[PDB]
Amino acid sequence: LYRLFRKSNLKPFERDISTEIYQAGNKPCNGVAGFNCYFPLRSYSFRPTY
Amino acid sequence: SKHTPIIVREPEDLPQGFSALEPLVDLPIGINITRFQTLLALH
Amino acid sequence: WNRKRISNCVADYSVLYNLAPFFTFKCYGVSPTKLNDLCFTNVYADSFV
């Protein structure tokens, strides 16, 4: 599992594993995922043909 | 840590003088800690 | 194509991100939140149906 965004640059060796949805836009997301409501955890789906 | 016995006066705080503390305990915890609290023996 | 070479200007995607009708904001290669901080030689915009 990876991400594309987090709210701040981390200090060295911190283990913030929180999956709180980022409100990138002005939308009050509050758990509703979508555009400008980006869920953190994503996957890359590694294939042998990559 | 350091420990000293003082018996001269009770109500005054932080007795005047110089004392050297010594290293005892190291613990690789790796925890983001911003707050703490202390425990008391209660009846 | 309706490919318009949007260039020689600083692009503000915050208008499209913040106004009401536009909904999808997927981005590849760069983060979708860094677009207003990003400069381009050419912005190839292909408005399609």
Side-chain angles (χ1 to χ4, degrees), chain B residues 7-42:
Chain B
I7 70 179
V8 190
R9 82 285 182 275
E10 195 259 350
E12 286 294 327
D13 303 334
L14 277 296
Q16 287 84 64
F18 196 74
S19 179
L21 265 67
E22 289 160 62
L24 276 296
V25 171
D26 203 344
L27 290 152
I29 62 170
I31 319 171
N32 178 36
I33 298 169
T34 60
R35 221 159 69 227
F36 85 109
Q37 189 274 331
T38 181
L39 313 176
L40 279 168
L42 286 180

Side-chain angles (χ1 to χ4, degrees), chain A residues 5-42:
Chain A
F5 175 74
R6 204 196 160 276
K7 294 181 177 184
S8 68
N9 293 347
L10 274 191
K11 330 287 179 184
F13 302 129
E14 292 179 353
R15 295 184 180 275
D16 279 12
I17 57 177
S18 63
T19 64
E20 296 185 346
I21 278 165
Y22 314 119
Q23 317 204 0
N26 298 330
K27 303 176 184 181
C29 309
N30 290 318
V32 183
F35 312 113
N36 303 347
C37 290
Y38 300 98
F39 187 78
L41 287 182
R42 300 169 193 275

Side-chain angles (χ1 to χ4, degrees), chain A residues 4-5 24-27 34-36 38 42, chain C residues 17-18 22-27 31-33:
Chain A
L4 271 174
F5 175 74
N26 298 330
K27 303 176 184 181
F35 312 113
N36 303 347
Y38 300 98
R42 300 169 193 275
Chain C
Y17 268 55
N18 290 354
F22 298 125
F23 186 63
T24 78
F25 303 116
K26 298 184 181 185
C27 282
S31 189
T33 63

